[PDB]
UniProtKB/Swiss-Prot annotation, chains A, B, C, D:
UniProt name for this protein: 4,5:9,10-diseco-3-hydroxy-5,9,17-trioxoandrosta-1(10),2-diene-4-oate hydrolase
NCBIfam families referenced in this protein's UniProt entry, alphabetically: hydroxlase_HsaD
Residues forming the catalytic site: H263 (proton acceptor)
Miscellaneous remark of the record: Cholesterol metabolism contributes to the survival of M.tuberculosis in the host by helping the bacterial multiplication during earlier stages of infection and to the dissemination of the pathogen in the host.
Biological-process GO terms, alphabetical: biological process involved in interaction with host; lipid catabolic process; steroid biosynthetic process
Pathway assigned in UniProt: Lipid metabolism; steroid biosynthesis
Site (Transition state stabilizer): S108
GO molecular function per UniProt: 2,6-dioxo-6-phenylhexa-3-enoate hydrolase activity; 4,5-9,10-diseco-3-hydroxy-5,9,17-trioxoandrosta-1(10),2-diene-4-oate hydrolase activity; hydrolase activity, acting on acid carbon-carbon bonds, in ketonic substances
Family: Belongs to the AB hydrolase superfamily. HsaD family.
Organism: Mycobacterium tuberculosis (strain ATCC 25618 / H37Rv)
Quaternary organization: Homodimer.
Induction of its expression: Induced by KstR.
């Protein structure tokens, strides 16, 4: 199972042909699970879920999708509210692959796309696993913007290597995870003209009149499926206090908190994360 | 595996011979786990952990101990701070059975005894699983006393069947669990002259000069082992806001919250509870 | 000052004709302040702000409105979501008196009504002072229904004097405020047939399909004016954890919390509440 | 009023001789109030309460003390836990001036010092006003070290003008408070050798074995006097979640929260803070 063995592409229509890059594994398995990645600079499905895909492939039919703007997926230079924009694309891909009701596993930005999909097409989404997710999260104590949001903005404005490193350092509890190779790899992926076009579009998307579609904490009370919320106690991007509204309003919600863990739950606690997801999703 | 097959007794010394009733199962298993029960009227090891012991016996060497004052254990009429009182007894039993460092699984009152043991004899306690526990819990939002504490006091003052039922009803999310047979069984166990002597002692123990030993939320920052905190989102005795200090101060803490679940986690979510404990305790 | 001196009346149109009774004072003064009372059984504008109306009249033009269903206003037998129903009546009173943009003061149901008016009729509302308010509260930690809400529900089903007293005691921190006179007085008011019809018309408006209008926590981020939230630390009806989302989302919010104070701030801490309200509004 | 007019000095004994510098005003007035300043780099009693000392002097006998390490008091090269070290110096100033039981006002480090004195010298303290205070705070949701605490740490390691400005900006909500004059002034003060020795003596007292004396959250339940906590909703140094345990455990506590206010309450909301402080203390 490698980057290349599992690669796949598809074309879907969101206001015009939209290419989605993805990964696929565990092809003989009965149950299909879609993984949606978080959203830093140079982020993608594979670097996000490499400690997870192989483990999840033993039980599930795994589809880890680069979200428009990321990975090898169209970096259009214009889009609306991002989570909606990405759910629409995901809807297209479901329809194509002929997926029915699937369970979604997304962290951070991915979790917001997950939840947005789930509200917009209720019948198509099953159980949710959400790791330090945006959208449905609202920090009741932490002044916004947070440290992690600020460090990302700083990089969006001045995309230096020093700025990227500062950002990656608040991604994790154990800062030893931030190596030279990691910073170099993300910086290269992130400093392309295409990726910066994507970065510009996301930036402009915030002023759109549709901002309310990002405020999912107002809406998750409508969710009917079981939802597993997963947070690192030391998340500095989407802090723990932002889990409360969701935990309170979602009827069949569950919360699991890991001490000594930051924003990258699926990396820093990859083993417990894996087991937790597999078990919550019924073991396949 | 029945009440009677698993019964066992021992005599230990806490300021004089103290008899402890207990249960034992999975006797050929390598790892030993001690279960400590919650503390209502007429509560004991077996009625507390009947949906759990057999499942846990497949993996672990299980010891579910009636805490002095409960079950078939000495109902002295005088004691100090209860958690300390019960840890001392547990220390005696460990020493006797020759247990070394063991993992403790206790809910409510049991969790407080668990934590108190763990602070008082560091070397003897391993991983902790704590369900809606007293002691280390401190409700930052809920006015004290809570609904559940009030309903217990009411029964302590006027031990009627109507009072007991009212208490049991705030024990759970699904109130259908409170049946006629359950109320009758607890009321009979609880209305004996011995049990009321125990109830009187607990009551007097609160005025003791040692009250500070019940305030474990001040102390859990000293815990070094992994701790799994488990709460029902609808706990009306020890509410969710009382988990925050513990989650924050214990270095290797984890929190899992179940929506649609009250104070009796091991009953209302017995299946998920079981798997969670087994996995956290290393599968044996 | 007194009831009949201040007493006054109006007749507006909410899906028909609606009699609102109010109380007027400080007609000399330069700034108009609307008061809105709490929604307990047998509650009305005058007995609610009895310790507040005089003091405020020395600074402002006071209008203490009896909300539909209470006091001497029309107690109809059905209505929709109550706050919006009470905001429609008040908007009606507004245009009838050529009121401009006015500050609003309201505890409990009154607070919910105020917020809802402030959201429905934006040009018409200014500085708001909400004491333990409904609607815009969402108890992030407290299991619903809360203990105070259950007592009220208990009284609607069974409107005895005992059930009312049980409710009134859960209302305050210092229980000596609950004098037998007080109970007699509210219970006299509450047990008329017209009162119980409002009590029943209300309790089934909960089931409307416009329930969402009561979930104001979802909306207050749109509020533009300074809002001051006051809460009693020991409020067992709308607990302190209910204030969080609003403190967070209302741009110009402020929170004051009184320890040793329950659900009736304007009563249990009348002085501090008065002085604080007078200053927040502008000395007038 | 001014520096040298109010200026004053003393010489007490903390494990030797200790020069404390203070500021006196309102000697006419009947009630004595101690002020204790914040602990930023180059901070001192006068510049801290510059917008507060005059107004308070029209009501009380004001004593604004420079804490050991700050302003014109002895900046020694080592000490133990700092609050307790500062409370010992102040108790010394107390007996030297035949002070009785006095109210104490202190933000940040000052608040921590005040609380600690109030716990060490119980007979000597009265009503307390703490603005975003240290020690007695514990951030239940915010990962430590916070963002403001990191900037400070950053300056100690590298005391440039840029690092100081970065710190001062994280101090306030309205950044226009951070004038280049202001930076120049603090940086002039902070970069002397005697200042940096205090800055370094402090930063290594953290490692003492008396660290526990700084964990005041563990103790405040013992406080008997009325305490008013004031906090800025957007405080990025000691965030709002830090106020919870104290609001909960201090019997006669009160909390006021300002939106659009950071870590310097006495500055960003000087008027409200003054009026609120004057009233809480008794008009004097």
């Amino acid at each position: 199972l490698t980057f290349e063995s599992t690669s796949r592409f598809a074309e879907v229509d969101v206001d015009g042909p939209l290419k989605l890059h993805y990964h696929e594994a565990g092809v003989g398995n009965d149950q299909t699970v879609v993984l949606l990645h978080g959203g830093g600079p140079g982020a993608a499905s594979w670097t996000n879920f490499s400690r997870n895909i192989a483990v999840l492939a033993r039980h599930f039919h795994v589809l880890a999708v680069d979200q428009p703007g990321y990975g090898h997926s169209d970096k259009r230079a214009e889009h609306g509210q991002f989570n909606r924009y990405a759910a629409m694309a995901l809807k297209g891909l479901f329809d194509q692959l002929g997926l029915g009701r699937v369970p979604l596993v997304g962290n951070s930005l991915g979790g917001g796309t997950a939840v947005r999909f789930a509200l917009d097409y209720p019948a198509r989404a099953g159980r949710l696993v959400l790791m330090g997710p945006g959208g449905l999260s609202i920090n009741l104590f932490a002044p916004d913007p947070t440290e992690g949001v600020k460090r990302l903005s700083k990089f969006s404005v001045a995309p230096t290597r020093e700025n990227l490193e500062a950002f990656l350092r608040v991604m994790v509890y154990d800062k030893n995870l931030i190596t030279p190779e990691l910073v170099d790899q993300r910086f290269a992926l992130a400093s392309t003209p295409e990726s910066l076009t994507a970065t510009r579009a996301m930036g402009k998307s915030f002023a759109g009149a549709d901002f309310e579609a990002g405020m999912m904490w107002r809406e998750v009370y409508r969710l009917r499926q079981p939802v597993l919320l997963i947070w690192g106690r030391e998340d500095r991007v989407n802090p723990l206090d932002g889990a409360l509204v969701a935990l309170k309003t979602i009827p069949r919600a569950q919360l699991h908190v890991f001490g000594q863990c930051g924003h990258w739950v699926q990396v820093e606690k990859f083993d417990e994360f894996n087991k937790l997801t597999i078990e919550f999703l019924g073991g396949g």
